Design a protein around this ligand. Sequence first.
Ligand SMILES: Nc1ncnc2c1ncn2[C@@H]1O[C@H](COP(=O)(O)OP(=O)(O)NP(=O)(O)O)[C@@H](O)[C@H]1O
Lengths: 51, 50, 50, 398
Amino acid sequence: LLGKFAVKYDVNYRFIDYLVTLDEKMKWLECGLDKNDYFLENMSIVMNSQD
Amino acid sequence: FSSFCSEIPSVSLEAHEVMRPDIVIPTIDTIKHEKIFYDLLNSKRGIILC
Amino acid sequence: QDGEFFDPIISRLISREFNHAGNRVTVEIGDHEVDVSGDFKLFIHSCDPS
Amino acid sequence: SQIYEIYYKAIFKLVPEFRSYTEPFARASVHLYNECKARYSTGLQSHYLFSPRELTRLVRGVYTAINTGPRQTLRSLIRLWAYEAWRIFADRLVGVKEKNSFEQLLYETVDKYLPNQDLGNISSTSLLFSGLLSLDFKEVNKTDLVNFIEERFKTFCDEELEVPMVIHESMVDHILRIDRALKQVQGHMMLIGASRTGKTILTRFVAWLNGLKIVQPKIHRHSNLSDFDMILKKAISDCSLKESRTCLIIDESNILETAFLERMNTLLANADIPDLFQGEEYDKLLNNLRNKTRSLGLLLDTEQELYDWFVGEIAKNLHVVFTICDPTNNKSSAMISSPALFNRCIINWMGDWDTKTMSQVANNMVDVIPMEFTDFIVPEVNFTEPIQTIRDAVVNIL
Ligand SMILES: Nc1ncnc2c1ncn2[C@@H]1O[C@H](COP(=O)(O)OP(=O)(O)NP(=O)(O)O)[C@@H](O)[C@H]1O
């Protein structure tokens, strides 16, 4: 969709690396969070965004 | 003694009286219905309207 | 702890609705208006996807 | 036709010139009622139900609109009729073809009964143009409406609770519908909007516009019937004794039990709840009624007269608005089939965003301009808007 209409996106993109701090990643995993990219993607969505 | 039917009262209510929720425009069925209610109620038998 | 079951007293709290004052911030819950802190956070949590 | 011929004969005292036309409006009204009841059936939608109430609403709506309205010609009356016809009957209709089916029926009805060629386009737009901002409920200019609404919506967004909001034509049509509805003597509305559609907040907007007291029932899993009674109880007292003119907003979140269903099956349908004020509580109310009545300059002999005044007060000054999302589930469908609901509720069908208004929302949110560079490609390939900017591209992608 970003291609069909003309808008550039980073061809190499990963949600985690983009929106999470090392410290954040480190801090979450400290609290007992699971190893997964998934559970990191999730923990980001919960924490990183509350409106 | 005679048998006659469907004689109804004429109603004329003012415009501002048209918005009263408790109102009825008498029709043949109104009277017929009101009357069988009464008859049933004078027999002390009960009514259920569905 | 049980999101499975949820009662609307929190509804005013889910949707962000608050009556603002000079200093205080109040949110109606049930029959009483309680003051919100802002150091306050909420997490609803459930177990079964059913 | 006989019943409502009497009704029109009563409301047309305000337009004696058109007195001759009592039957053909009554006939046209009953005709429409019949055809509608025939074309749209419960097999398509659960909420297509037509009763004499629809005929009742149609006369009532017309009565107030004539009374409050400007000097009428025959065109004036029959278009007004067609407006109320639209709102009472077709506004509940989903999709398009069915609303078009109704327009066709309306044209047919007018032709069959009242043949004036002075009419314009009688389609749902081109008619309603229902005056609120203009003080008497006439037709309006439509440019003035959108502006009036928008400035009064800016005001309302700032002055009352701040949930950031957006405007669209879609909003405007339903606003006129909600207001006209809250203007009608004994009447209530239910908005079928899906969810997040902004139907509750719109109700609140009109409530704020016409200065109606808003009441949203406060309840939960542990909430009792005694509890909902007191809300209704107190709400009715204010609607009568203090002349508060309140709008009661029920959401489908609010119901943890059906008990909420029924006590209002009453309040909507007839104009009172008999059980609600009872025991000594009845005598207390009665005392107050005598006082308020006498303060209005009317000394009412009997008790039933007081109570008849009281009930009439609940009728004209208490409005209820339901907002429901998915009519399809059993929880909301219990609300739905329930007749006293659907037949004294004006059913207004909103739905998921219109995919056009989706752009109006999107564009109005990206109004702030962080947007950079150039479009390497003015779009060359391939509904939001004619697409020029990166802005348009983004709302189209989204
Ligand atoms: N124009 C709008 N701009 C932005 N958000 C909107 C708009 N309209 C609706 N919303 C969203 O939907 C809500 C509007 O409130 P509300 O009217 O209660 O929605 P609703 O359609 O009534 N849902 P419901 O309680 O089932 O009736 C807010 O939480 C917003 O997130």
